Design an enzyme around this catalytic site. Structure first.
Site, mmCIF file in Angstrom:
data_model
loop_
_atom_site.group_PDB
_atom_site.id
_atom_site.type_symbol
_atom_site.label_atom_id
_atom_site.label_comp_id
_atom_site.label_asym_id
_atom_site.label_seq_id
_atom_site.Cartn_x
_atom_site.Cartn_y
_atom_site.Cartn_z
ATOM 1 N N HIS A 197 79.241 24.731 -22.608
ATOM 2 C CA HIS A 197 79.936 25.829 -21.929
ATOM 3 C C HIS A 197 79.800 27.159 -22.663
ATOM 4 O O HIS A 197 80.644 28.060 -22.500
ATOM 5 C CB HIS A 197 81.433 25.528 -21.699
ATOM 6 C CG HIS A 197 81.710 24.198 -21.061
ATOM 7 N ND1 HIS A 197 80.757 23.478 -20.368
ATOM 8 C CD2 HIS A 197 82.851 23.472 -20.993
ATOM 9 C CE1 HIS A 197 81.295 22.358 -19.922
ATOM 10 N NE2 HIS A 197 82.566 22.336 -20.278
ATOM 11 N N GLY A 235 89.665 40.159 0.630
ATOM 12 C CA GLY A 235 88.916 39.710 1.787
ATOM 13 C C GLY A 235 87.960 38.554 1.562
ATOM 14 O O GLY A 235 86.851 38.559 2.112
ATOM 15 N N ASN A 286 84.616 28.602 16.797
ATOM 16 C CA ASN A 286 83.700 29.200 17.753
ATOM 17 C C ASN A 286 82.242 29.093 17.301
ATOM 18 O O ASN A 286 81.393 29.872 17.746
ATOM 19 C CB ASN A 286 84.154 30.621 18.079
ATOM 20 C CG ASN A 286 84.011 31.571 16.927
ATOM 21 O OD1 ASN A 286 83.582 31.218 15.826
ATOM 22 N ND2 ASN A 286 84.394 32.814 17.176
ATOM 23 N N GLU A 337 81.251 38.807 11.860
ATOM 24 C CA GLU A 337 80.038 39.606 11.586
ATOM 25 C C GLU A 337 79.158 39.581 12.806
ATOM 26 O O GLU A 337 78.337 40.420 12.971
ATOM 27 C CB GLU A 337 79.220 39.185 10.378
ATOM 28 C CG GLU A 337 79.781 38.162 9.449
ATOM 29 C CD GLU A 337 79.906 38.695 8.042
ATOM 30 O OE1 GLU A 337 79.101 38.384 7.209
ATOM 31 O OE2 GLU A 337 80.847 39.394 7.765
HETATM 32 C C1 LIG Z 1 83.078 23.265 -13.613
HETATM 33 C C2 LIG Z 1 83.605 22.281 -14.606
HETATM 34 N N1 LIG Z 1 84.932 22.070 -14.619
HETATM 35 C C3 LIG Z 1 85.377 21.177 -15.509
HETATM 36 C C4 LIG Z 1 84.573 20.507 -16.402
HETATM 37 C C5 LIG Z 1 85.143 19.512 -17.375
HETATM 38 N N2 LIG Z 1 84.617 18.144 -17.155
HETATM 39 C C6 LIG Z 1 83.610 17.630 -17.831
HETATM 40 S S1 LIG Z 1 83.220 16.089 -17.310
HETATM 41 C C7 LIG Z 1 84.468 16.134 -16.118
HETATM 42 C C8 LIG Z 1 84.701 14.969 -15.203
HETATM 43 C C9 LIG Z 1 83.433 14.496 -14.531
HETATM 44 O O1 LIG Z 1 83.758 13.388 -13.658
HETATM 45 P P1 LIG Z 1 82.683 12.517 -12.910
HETATM 46 O O2 LIG Z 1 81.734 13.389 -12.186
HETATM 47 O O3 LIG Z 1 83.431 11.520 -12.039
HETATM 48 O O4 LIG Z 1 82.028 11.696 -14.082
HETATM 49 P P2 LIG Z 1 82.182 10.286 -14.787
HETATM 50 O O5 LIG Z 1 83.398 9.594 -14.275
HETATM 51 O O6 LIG Z 1 80.864 9.572 -14.490
HETATM 52 O O7 LIG Z 1 82.223 10.591 -16.265
HETATM 53 C C10 LIG Z 1 85.114 17.312 -16.151
HETATM 54 C C11 LIG Z 1 86.251 17.747 -15.288
HETATM 55 C C12 LIG Z 1 83.180 20.807 -16.313
HETATM 56 N N3 LIG Z 1 82.280 20.225 -17.110
HETATM 57 N N4 LIG Z 1 82.717 21.690 -15.410
HETATM 58 C C1 LIG Z 2 83.546 34.777 -0.081
HETATM 59 C C2 LIG Z 2 83.065 35.597 1.074
HETATM 60 N N1 LIG Z 2 81.762 35.495 1.410
HETATM 61 C C3 LIG Z 2 81.369 36.230 2.456
HETATM 62 C C4 LIG Z 2 82.197 37.075 3.161
HETATM 63 C C5 LIG Z 2 81.699 37.846 4.347
HETATM 64 N N2 LIG Z 2 82.306 37.376 5.618
HETATM 65 C C6 LIG Z 2 83.313 37.987 6.215
HETATM 66 S S1 LIG Z 2 83.796 37.205 7.618
HETATM 67 C C7 LIG Z 2 82.583 36.001 7.404
HETATM 68 C C8 LIG Z 2 82.455 34.888 8.397
HETATM 69 C C9 LIG Z 2 83.798 34.323 8.791
HETATM 70 O O1 LIG Z 2 83.595 33.133 9.588
HETATM 71 P P1 LIG Z 2 84.752 32.397 10.347
HETATM 72 O O2 LIG Z 2 85.772 31.972 9.364
HETATM 73 O O3 LIG Z 2 84.156 31.317 11.266
HETATM 74 O O4 LIG Z 2 85.291 33.570 11.271
HETATM 75 P P2 LIG Z 2 85.252 34.021 12.788
HETATM 76 O O5 LIG Z 2 83.991 33.316 13.363
HETATM 77 O O6 LIG Z 2 86.534 33.677 13.469
HETATM 78 O O7 LIG Z 2 84.989 35.489 12.766
HETATM 79 C C10 LIG Z 2 81.873 36.220 6.272
HETATM 80 C C11 LIG Z 2 80.740 35.409 5.740
HETATM 81 C C12 LIG Z 2 83.558 37.097 2.734
HETATM 82 N N3 LIG Z 2 84.480 37.860 3.335
HETATM 83 N N4 LIG Z 2 83.970 36.353 1.697
HETATM 84 MG MG LIG Z 3 83.718 31.108 13.496
#
Ligand SMILES: Cc1ncc(C[n+]2csc(CCOP(=O)(O)OP(=O)(O)O)c2C)c(N)n1
Ligand SMILES: Cc1ncc(C[n+]2csc(CCOP(=O)(O)OP(=O)(O)O)c2C)c(N)n1
Ligand SMILES: [Mg+2]
Ligand SMILES: [Mg+2]
Lengths: 537, 539
Positions: free
Chosen positions: B114, B396, B450, B456
């Site tokens: 990490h 947003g 929908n 968008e």
């Molecule tokens: C994004 C992220 N969040 C948290 C961790 C901490 N972490 C390391 S291993 C693990 C659990 C992995 O579980 P799983 O995929 O079931 O593996 P296994 O049981 O085979 O060890 C976590 C939470 C990480 N490595 N990355």
């Molecule tokens: C994390 C993130 N990625 C992208 C956007 C851009 N964005 C705004 S609305 C939208 C689509 C929303 O889809 P949905 O929830 O199905 O809405 P609806 O079809 O009712 O408009 C996206 C990608 C955002 N606001 N946030």
């Molecule tokens: Mg939609």
């Protein structure tokens, strides 16, 4: 549709090897997206969220040598930050394109959606600075040479770059270049080259036995074939560590297993650590790769080559491209280096043995952190295997989404996904992207009903190591109206062997829920779980 | 188990209003997690990923006034950055605790998992600086007073804070505090308060009709009851914008609808924009909130109140707490504002969907809506008393809503939670539905399906493939993310079916997921005004 900055960026991206663009649309990048759609040279790949998209681009780049991610200002780019950071940590050249509000809006300090509400538009650009080797804010006055600078640095360092593309800048006029973007091949100063060559030669000339240890930087800088031909022309004991696994055909003479410090098989320890000279090529001795820094290799025992500098014993020689350092060492070695080197119930042990009989040349094998990666380290890989593991950054969930990017890069190669049940929860929605795009990976979910790796480190009975228990074999039919997926739950080695035979030709997406014991850990995991939490009592 | 820094931090968490901790475990925070588990006062809530955990803490903080997130160094904290950013943008006090390698390991620059592989351990701390009001790296020598400083600053500003907790520091000996951590109420210098009072009075004394516009900063700083009492004791025209919806009982006299600039209903435009003085309380006139900055409110027409400063016309009065500014204006309004404010189809459409939901909502509801055709339809809901209306229109981030709902239900197990999410939005955070089912929560989840990205679609490229999504089998998701879901799912395409289903799930005895089938190109009224003055920008 006159040629504009958006088109120039796309032309230069494809020059670098990316034929696809991953990401998620937003109003600030939609007009740029129209250029991606209309282009015959770049294929848009919509992802289920931005974190997954950044993981997918990473896996793609580990297959094609380059990748690109598109997000929208603020909400999109910050959702992808962990992906780009992992690409930086593991030297994966992913280009993060961020579509942004138009420059006039930014200068007026408007209270726009996806801002902190303070009128400031450079916060997120600055927060990306530590996790990229180059970044730029594109303007009408700098666009084309800033694009070229950032992509060029990406190619040189094999690391992520960042471009903020305001919506108006993307529409500004540009000219198609006659020449593709290329990184001119660097060359060391000849006196610098001689100094390193002489020191390496004099060191190798006194070696009774020399061994070769290569790792992931070889992969990132395109030197896999050079390393394979080296040990073919100069047979010797050789290994990789977990990160660079896949550099070598591990059936070849002189390969005894993956090096992991004191956790190595005894034959590997003797072959590598027992040699009086060990060539360390593109190597990074991380805590996971060395069983808590218990590798036994001294400076006087070693010669090491990094991307811009190499070391002989105690002396560093800086400003030597890793390509030239390797070429030097290959020629010098050529000048010496002489004298050639079915059960019942499923356990970790018989699972990896069953999987061993299954893998084949051409496989793309991805494994997540947890028992997946630390069991897969013991796989003896055949030729032409792309083995994708992320042990330095170590972000669970990476593997499932990275597999989607890798399969996009290589539709005709067989993709095997080894993920824990816990890891797959973090990025499950990208399974829906694989089904939408009619991909046929073989996804093996190691179901031991929680965070088994964390149980090994601390608190095996603690409820924070528990997860929601999912019905894995039913997920494809929830994330698709017409999944066409083959799902099995297996608890016996014989069932797994039979299922593996059935999915061998990957004509459909397959999901295999592998039922494993809760307290079962692969050999390396037991060895790595002895000094992990040693720092704090 | 001697009392240590880990325990002191948890005690301060309870003092600040948090009874739960959200997050994802990692080897760098496991020993701290042992103290969370053992604590009788803090309940660990493991989440399916860190982004969702940070969204869930945000929703919890909008119910309880404070929340806390735990991640692991690097991979965890960076996965949550977009959540913390949205909490900063919308003034939500979420505390980000990052479990980190022990200090000696950091000082040695070891090549640890990490990290970026450079021996550097402060990169991510620095990257969090723009999205927090306070942060600290906890050491043995500063732990308890850095904890108190960061939490105190979070309470004053109602914004996120950050604490890096090296594993060894967490075990260092500490002492339980006798007194809870409190945010002492600031007081303006009395001459400074007087200057604002006199100028506000001179404006209000000559105002023929005065209107009140309150928004989200009122909610964050705990002043909802003050604003309701203001308009009960002093009847007059009042409104909120989208972000502050829920401040007022919208059936009460003087309320005509939510203000959204030129997209407002005509009665609202006249009530607010037609007044010669508009008191703007805790307001941020964002593009979404004003239909592309088409609000018509001039400086001389307005008085505004921000957390630390207030304005009358062109003159700013700084160093005035929003609470005292409000108390002053309540008094002046009681003096000068003497008014009596003038007071089922077949196929599912946007119009009959919101009309159906309008009849269904009740006092006590927690209503969350995501960006898209959800929030901009929900803006027209006429909210009864005691509704918590959670929308995130400034930051947003789609996907926020489903995960925030899991946090909101955790905070208020006995309140009815209604989740309005698009099919696109729900995909980004779907795995937290599994956490809802694991914890046996009973929200009412309406997936407005929908079949793509309609919002968008309206603004740009309606026929473009990038607005398409993978098509999911929504009514099968609970049975995929649980071995024994305490859930019932329905797919509805007719207004009467929706009415019937809503009646059945009124007392939320199970989780309910309703896949609401809506037309592809159907957009709510307010969006039609926001879609024309959005592609009026960067094109
Ligand atoms: C994004 C992220 N969040 C948290 C961790 C901490 N972490 C390391 S291993 C693990 C659990 C992995 O579980 P799983 O995929 O079931 O593996 P296994 O049981 O085979 O060890 C976590 C939470 C990480 N490595 N990355
Ligand atoms: C994390 C993130 N990625 C992208 C956007 C851009 N964005 C705004 S609305 C939208 C689509 C929303 O889809 P949905 O929830 O199905 O809405 P609806 O079809 O009712 O408009 C996206 C990608 C955002 N606001 N946030
Ligand atoms: Mg939609
Ligand atoms: Mg597991």
């Amino acid at each position: 549709t006159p040629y504009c900055v958006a088109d120039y960026l796309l032309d230069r991206l494809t020059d670098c090897g990316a034929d696809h663009l991953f990401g998620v649309p937003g109003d600030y990048n939609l007009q740029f997206l129209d250029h991606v759609i209309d282009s015959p040279d770049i294929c848009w790949v919509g992802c289920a969220n931005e974190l997954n998209a950044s993981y997918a681009a990473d896996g793609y780049a580990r297959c094609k040598g380059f990748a690109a991610l598109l997000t929208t200002f603020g909400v999109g780019e910050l959702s992808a930050m962990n992906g780009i950071a992992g690409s930086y940590a593991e030297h994966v050249p992913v280009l993060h394109i961020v579509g942004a509000p138009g420059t006039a809006s930014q200068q007026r300090g408007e209270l726009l959606h996806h801002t902190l509400g303070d009128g400031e538009f450079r916060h997120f650009y600055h927060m990306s600075e530590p996790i990229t080797v180059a970044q730029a804010i594109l303007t009408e006055q700098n666009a084309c040479y800033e694009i070229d600078r950032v992509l060029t640095t990406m190619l040189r360092e094999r690391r992520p770059g960042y471009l903020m593309l305001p919506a108006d800048v993307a529409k500004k006029a540009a000219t198609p270049p006659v020449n593709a973007l290329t990184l001119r091949h660097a060359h060391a100063d000849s006196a610098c080259l001689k100094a390193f060559r002489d020191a390496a030669e004099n060191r190798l000339a006194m070696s009774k036995r020399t061994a070769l240890l290569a790792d992931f930087l070889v992969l990132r800088h395109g030197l896999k074939h050079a390393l394979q031909k080296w040990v073919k022309d100069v047979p010797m004991a050789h290994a990789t560590m977990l990160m660079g696994k896949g550099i070598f055909d591990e059936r070849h003479v002189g390969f005894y297993g993956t090096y992991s410090g004191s956790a190595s098989a005894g034959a590997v320890k003797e072959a590598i650590e027992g040699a009086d000279t060990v060539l360390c090529i593109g190597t990074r001795f991380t805590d996971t790769l060395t069983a808590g820094f218990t590798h036994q290799l001294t400076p006087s025992q070693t010669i090491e080559v990094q991307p811009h500098a190499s070391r002989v014993g105690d002396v560093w020689f800086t400003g030597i491209p890793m390509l030239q350092a390797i070429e030097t060492l290959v020629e010098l070695c050529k000048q010496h280096v002489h004298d050639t080197p079915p059960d019942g119930s499923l356990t970790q042990d018989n699972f990896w043995k069953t999987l061993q009989t299954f893998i084949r040349p051409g496989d793309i094998i991805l494994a997540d952190q947890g028992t997946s990666a630390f069991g897969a380290i013991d796989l003896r890989l055949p030729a032409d295997v792309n083995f994708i593991v992320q042990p330095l950054w170590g972000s669970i969930g990476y593997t499932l989404a990275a597999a989607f990017g890798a399969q996009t890069a290589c539709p005709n190669r067989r993709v095997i996904v080894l993920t824990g049940d816990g890891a797959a929860q973090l990025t499950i929605q990208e399974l829906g992207s694989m089904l939408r795009d009619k991909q046929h990976p073989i996804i093996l979910v190691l179901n031991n009903e929680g965070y088994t790796v964390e149980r090994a480190i601390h608190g095996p009975e603690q409820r924070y190591n528990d997860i929601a228990l999912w019905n894995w074999t039913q997920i494809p039919q929830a994330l698709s109206l017409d999944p066409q997926a083959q799902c099995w739950r297996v608890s016996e080695a014989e069932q797994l062997a039979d299922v593996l035979e059935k999915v061998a030709h990957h004509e459909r997406l397959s999901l295999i829920e592998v039922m494993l014991p809760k307290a079962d850990i692969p050999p390396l995991l037991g060895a790595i779980t002895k000094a992990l939490e040693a720092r704090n009592s």
